């Protein structure tokens, strides 16, 4: 309907939250002269898989949107949720928070690790 990047101009609250993110942006993600052709296929595969492994380690596989139990750090960006979601888009958003990406990835991993650990303790004592 909107097309692969069609939702880009609709601000985050509509740009991805309409599941346009799944319908095309994600669906298309993995959709001797000719050496280049194998290289392209392989690299596309690798990128797809890296995204999935990250979702996997964070406990977010099988989801378009995945909430965690990690609080947002306003130190990375302090804005109201209504402006963040309704007037700003994803490209603009990344421009503002790109520098905190690695911090959050580390936090996400540790949280998931602790969550699983706690479940493991609960089973042991069940």
């Amino acid at each position: 309907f909107l097309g692969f990047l069609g939702a880009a101009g609709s601000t985050m609250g509509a740009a991805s939250m309409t599941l346009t993110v799944q319908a095309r942006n994600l669906l298309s993600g993995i959709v001797v002269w000719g050496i280049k052709q194998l290289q392209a296929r392989v690299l596309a595969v690798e990128r797809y898989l890296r995204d999935q492994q990250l979702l996997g380690i964070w406990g977010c596989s099988g989801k378009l949107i995945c909430c965690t139990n990690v609080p947002w750090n306003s130190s990375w960006s302090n804005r109201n949720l209504s402006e963040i979601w309704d007037n700003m888009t994803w490209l603009q958003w990344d421009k503002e928070i790109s520098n905190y990406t690695q911090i959050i990835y580390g936090l996400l991993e540790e949280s998931q690790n602790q969550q699983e650990k706690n479940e493991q303790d609960l089973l042991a004592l069940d």
Partner: protein, 439 residues
């Protein structure tokens, strides 16, 4: 709270390898057996409320275009017969009798001592040549002019160089963005964004001075350069109107083959039926008149609003860049464009003679000279000029008059003249945003 999102329509500038595609045979050197089918339908999506920044001078699509063309060109000669046995002393005289003055001295009639498939006896043969491929040995005795530089290979007369358009396509995870803007001149933001899987097809036409068989500007002549004050850079001028040129090779040729060896034959010019005439191109005069004026108005807008502009022909130097070069029918033409650049625009039919060569060092490489076999009959070519490659004279602060000359040499600029509409980006679908939700 942190929420993780996947499938976000966000991207970064990126460099990757693109796929070539054509025609959604073993003929045609430009990958027609190698490229994949194009998508049968345009997939263009206009994106609203977005802008994007382009820079045609920093693009990488052009490097691939360059790389692909040189590679395809080289591959086309790999299985072809080498002409090593041909570089022998030529016993040679002038072609005469039927020359209509203009061609005097242009054609040579030379004799050779050639091999046969039996490696013992030789055959006495003769053939005709353009003088540009033949040089005197002893200051009669002649040699192939490129003999003393590098190896020459005969193109296989199975293929030609017809510029069948190639579309470039993104791999998954990539997309190509295009401007639909009219004012955009190759750099900076444009308020126009549209995303495609593939570019339109671009014809790999190789030329100097005049850009042929390309796309046209829609509203105005667009003039683009990397640096408007840098006289060491070229200028790309995109016309908003075509200028038709009718070119000819007015000689009814007969071709003959000479067996050289066990599965090898040389294609030689045999003779000319009827008289001998000089090759030429007929440019619409009225169109050129108006076209130049439009170009000048636009040049004036960039600089020189109160000054005047003159055009002059090329500088002394290598034929490959001092004249207009093109290929048509597989034949290689060199044309004198001085008749197009002999004027001053102060505001307030054209016949171009041509020359023909058979040994072409395309891309200036060693051991890669290509021999263009003769084409029988008479050749007519019709095409439009879609733009110009111009240079501007330096050495002066007298702003009263600027001087421009036709240029060309680095083929990258011709490709840039079409590719500039596009940018390659990589999609990065995974990211986070603050929410009020927690697992």
């Amino acid at each position: 709270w942190v929420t993780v999102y996947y499938g976000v329509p966000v991207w970064k500038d990126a460099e990757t390898t693109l796929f070539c595609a054509s025609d959604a045979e073993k003929h045609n050197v430009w990958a027609t057996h190698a490229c994949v089918p194009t998508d049968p339908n345009p997939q263009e999506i206009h994106l609203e409320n977005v802008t994007e920044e382009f820079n045609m001078w920093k693009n990488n699509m052009v490097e691939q275009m360059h790389t692909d063309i040189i590679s395809l060109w080289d591959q086309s000669l790999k299985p072809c017969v080498k002409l090593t046995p041909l570089c022998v002393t030529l016993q040679c005289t002038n072609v005469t009798n039927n020359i209509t003055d203009d061609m005097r001295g242009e054609l040579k009639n030379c004799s050779f001592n050639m091999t046969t498939e039996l490696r013992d006896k030789k055959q006495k043969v003769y053939s005709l040549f353009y003088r540009l491929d033949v040089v005197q040995i002893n200051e009669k005795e002649y040699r192939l002019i490129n003999c003393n530089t590098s190896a020459i290979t005969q193109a296989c007369p199975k293929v030609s160089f017809e510029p069948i358009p190639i579309h470039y396509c993104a791999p998954a995870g990539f997309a190509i963005l295009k401007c639909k803007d009219k004012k955009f001149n190759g750099t900076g933001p444009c308020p126009s964004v549209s995303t495609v899987q593939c570019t339109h097809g671009i014809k790999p036409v190789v030329s100097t001075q005049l850009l042929l068989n390309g796309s046209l500007a829609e509203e105005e002549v667009m003039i683009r350069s990397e640096n408007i004050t840098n006289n060491a850079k070229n200028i790309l001028v995109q016309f908003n109107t075509p200028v038709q040129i009718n070119c000819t090779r007015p000689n009814n040729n007969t071709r003959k083959s000479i067996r050289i060896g066990p599965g090898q034959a040389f294609y030689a010019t045999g003779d000319i039926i009827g008289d001998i005439r000089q090759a030429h191109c007929n440019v619409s005069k009225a169109t050129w008149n108006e076209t130049l004026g439009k170009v000048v108005k636009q040049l004036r807008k960039h600089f020189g609003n109160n000054t005047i502009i003159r055009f002059a022909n090329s500088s002394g130097g290598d034929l490959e860049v001092t004249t207009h070069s093109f290929n048509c029918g597989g034949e290689f033409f060199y044309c004198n464009t001085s008749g197009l650049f002999n004027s001053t625009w102060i505001s307030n039919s054209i016949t171009l003679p041509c020359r023909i060569k058979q040994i072409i060092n395309m891309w200036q490489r060693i051991g890669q000279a290509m021999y263009a076999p003769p084409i029988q009959g008479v050749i007519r070519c019709v095409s439009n000029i879609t733009g110009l490659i111009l240079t501007r004279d330096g050495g002066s602060t007298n702003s009263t008059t600027e001087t421009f000359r036709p240029g060309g040499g680095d083929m990258r600029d011709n490709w840039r003249s079409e590719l500039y509409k596009y940018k390659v980006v990589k999609i990065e679908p995974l990211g986070v945003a603050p929410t009020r939700c927690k697992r």
